[PDB]
Write an enzyme that holds these catalytic residues in place. Sequence first.
Site, PDB file in Angstrom:
ATOM      1  N   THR A  10      66.987  13.775  31.104  1.00 51.10           N
ATOM      2  CA  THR A  10      65.988  14.465  31.925  1.00 51.10           C
ATOM      3  C   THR A  10      64.596  13.865  31.685  1.00 51.10           C
ATOM      4  OG1 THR A  10      67.245  16.551  31.967  1.00 51.10           O
ATOM      5  CG2 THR A  10      64.895  16.690  32.438  1.00 51.10           C
ATOM      6  N   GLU A  46      73.736  16.926  25.336  1.00 51.82           N
ATOM      7  CA  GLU A  46      73.012  17.815  26.237  1.00 51.82           C
ATOM      8  C   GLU A  46      71.667  18.297  25.699  1.00 51.82           C
ATOM      9  OE1 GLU A  46      75.766  21.067  26.600  1.00 51.82           O
ATOM     10  OE2 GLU A  46      77.315  19.693  27.356  1.00 51.82           O
ATOM     11  N   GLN A  55      77.274  12.739  22.358  1.00 54.50           N
ATOM     12  CA  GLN A  55      78.474  13.362  21.793  1.00 54.50           C
ATOM     13  C   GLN A  55      78.979  12.493  20.638  1.00 54.50           C
ATOM     14  OE1 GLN A  55      78.361  15.173  24.960  1.00 54.50           O
ATOM     15  NE2 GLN A  55      77.314  13.313  25.673  1.00 54.50           N
ATOM     16  N   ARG A  68      73.216  17.685  35.976  1.00 55.75           N
ATOM     17  CA  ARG A  68      73.824  17.436  34.681  1.00 55.75           C
ATOM     18  C   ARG A  68      74.922  16.420  34.913  1.00 55.75           C
ATOM     19  NH1 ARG A  68      75.717  17.706  29.463  1.00 55.75           N
ATOM     20  NH2 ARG A  68      74.975  15.533  29.544  1.00 55.75           N
TER      21      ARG A  68
HETATM   22  N1  GDP Z   1      66.018  24.742  31.626  1.00 56.51           N
HETATM   23  C1  GDP Z   1      65.970  23.579  31.046  1.00 56.51           C
HETATM   24  N2  GDP Z   1      66.993  22.708  31.267  1.00 56.51           N
HETATM   25  C2  GDP Z   1      66.890  21.469  30.639  1.00 56.51           C
HETATM   26  C3  GDP Z   1      65.862  21.052  29.814  1.00 56.51           C
HETATM   27  N3  GDP Z   1      66.097  19.718  29.346  1.00 56.51           N
HETATM   28  C4  GDP Z   1      67.253  19.432  29.928  1.00 56.51           C
HETATM   29  N4  GDP Z   1      67.789  20.441  30.720  1.00 56.51           N
HETATM   30  C5  GDP Z   1      69.016  20.503  31.492  1.00 56.51           C
HETATM   31  O1  GDP Z   1      70.122  20.419  30.565  1.00 56.51           O
HETATM   32  C6  GDP Z   1      71.190  19.522  31.087  1.00 56.51           C
HETATM   33  C7  GDP Z   1      71.490  18.384  30.126  1.00 56.51           C
HETATM   34  O2  GDP Z   1      70.355  17.497  29.856  1.00 56.51           O
HETATM   35  P1  GDP Z   1      70.346  15.925  29.955  1.00 56.51           P
HETATM   36  O3  GDP Z   1      69.018  15.535  30.453  1.00 56.51           O
HETATM   37  O4  GDP Z   1      71.564  15.356  30.712  1.00 56.51           O
HETATM   38  O5  GDP Z   1      70.427  15.490  28.430  1.00 56.51           O
HETATM   39  P2  GDP Z   1      71.248  14.427  27.591  1.00 56.51           P
HETATM   40  O6  GDP Z   1      72.623  14.580  28.096  1.00 56.51           O
HETATM   41  O7  GDP Z   1      71.193  14.870  26.223  1.00 56.51           O
HETATM   42  O8  GDP Z   1      70.558  13.167  27.867  1.00 56.51           O
HETATM   43  C8  GDP Z   1      70.713  19.003  32.442  1.00 56.51           C
HETATM   44  O9  GDP Z   1      71.296  19.718  33.525  1.00 56.51           O
HETATM   45  C9  GDP Z   1      69.176  19.257  32.358  1.00 56.51           C
HETATM   46  O10 GDP Z   1      68.515  19.423  33.610  1.00 56.51           O
HETATM   47  C10 GDP Z   1      64.746  22.020  29.571  1.00 56.51           C
HETATM   48  O11 GDP Z   1      63.742  21.886  28.892  1.00 56.51           O
HETATM   49  N5  GDP Z   1      64.888  23.254  30.229  1.00 56.51           N
HETATM   50  F1  ALF Z   2      75.231  14.737  26.960  1.00 58.16           F
HETATM   51 AL1  ALF Z   2      74.237  13.385  26.337  1.00 58.16          AL
HETATM   52  F2  ALF Z   2      73.591  11.718  26.253  1.00 58.16           F
HETATM   53  F3  ALF Z   2      75.116  12.864  27.850  1.00 58.16           F
HETATM   54  F4  ALF Z   2      74.330  13.530  24.604  1.00 58.16           F
END
Ligand code: GDP
Ligand code: ALF
Length: 317
Positions: free
Chosen positions: A17, A12, A173, A147
């Site tokens: 994003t 997360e 994860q 998300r």
């Molecule tokens: N407020 C806010 N939310 C964010 C930001 N970056 C990501 N998110 C939110 O955090 C959640 C997880 O991010 P995601 O893009 O799925 O990241 P990943 O799972 O690590 O690839 C999503 O609902 C995003 O919209 C940010 O800079 N600000």
């Molecule tokens: F939650 Al992420 F890519 F789905 F680390």
Amino acid sequence: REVKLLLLGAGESGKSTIVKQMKIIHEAGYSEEECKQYKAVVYSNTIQSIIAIIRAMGRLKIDFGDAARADDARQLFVLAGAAEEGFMTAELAGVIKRLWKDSGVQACFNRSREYQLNDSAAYYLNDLDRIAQPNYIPTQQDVLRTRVKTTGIVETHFTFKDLHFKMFDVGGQRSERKKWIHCFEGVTAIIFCVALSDYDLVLAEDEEMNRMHESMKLFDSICNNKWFTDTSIILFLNKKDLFEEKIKKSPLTICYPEYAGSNTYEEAAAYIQCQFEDLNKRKDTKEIYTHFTCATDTKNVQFVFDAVTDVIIKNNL
Ligand SMILES: Nc1nc2c(ncn2[C@@H]2O[C@H](COP(=O)(O)OP(=O)(O)O)[C@@H](O)[C@H]2O)c(=O)[nH]1
Ligand code: ALF
Ligand SMILES: [Mg+2]
């Protein structure tokens, strides 16, 4: 000419994003047909969120402010099912709206670090009236806030500044990291994402491990890896927006005991930066291009990614 970007980082952190921003910034963004596919994901997130806060109210023992909500809670689960199928009755909306405004729900909301809640919880719940209109269509922003756990390897393509970009996004994860080694071949640059606002949270995968610490360990690993020696290591200290608010009320010492600065954005931000770059073992031969970002903020990602392209272009080209 081609360029391969690999997005990495713990769970997360915002990887996905950043990927959505590429479509919005270089492609026309998401069409109507496409925004509607995300309609179900927005309704799912909203219910999960409110339900998730309600669950915590039981474990932390927090009563609803008005027992009247006891029935809204019961109805929440009766009607909940629809949301998951992409529909939001007017009745459901009211139930969620009333629970969300309840002082009890709210007290549990401000203690979210004590459990697991989606960053976009407030964003949607506070826009219930909008996302609940009949024939509601997710906006660029709504879609960016969605998300959805990333498991496996997603591949995105787009053209910017004459370059044909191939972007790879993976899961973060502990269970998904064994897959990282699949995207290692020929990587022009790596964009390592770190959720700045995770300094006081705990890994969903392991209550006892601090999220910021997990991230640091991952950075030390990739960055210092011989293999990625001639690979541009770009560090994105993401979620600067949430960090900005949290640093005001949550002590940074939770994560960094020896932090003697104030609870303000600049000192706290710079400190977390130095901590990550200090992990870099060859400070003279290897360089780390860092950028503070808000993955959901399109204007911000555009200029930040513009700056990153120059470097990638002035180098690997
Ligand atoms: N407020 C806010 N939310 C964010 C930001 N970056 C990501 N998110 C939110 O955090 C959640 C997880 O991010 P995601 O893009 O799925 O990241 P990943 O799972 O690590 O690839 C999503 O609902 C995003 O919209 C940010 O800079 N600000
Ligand atoms: F939650 Al992420 F890519 F789905 F680390
Ligand atoms: Mg992802």
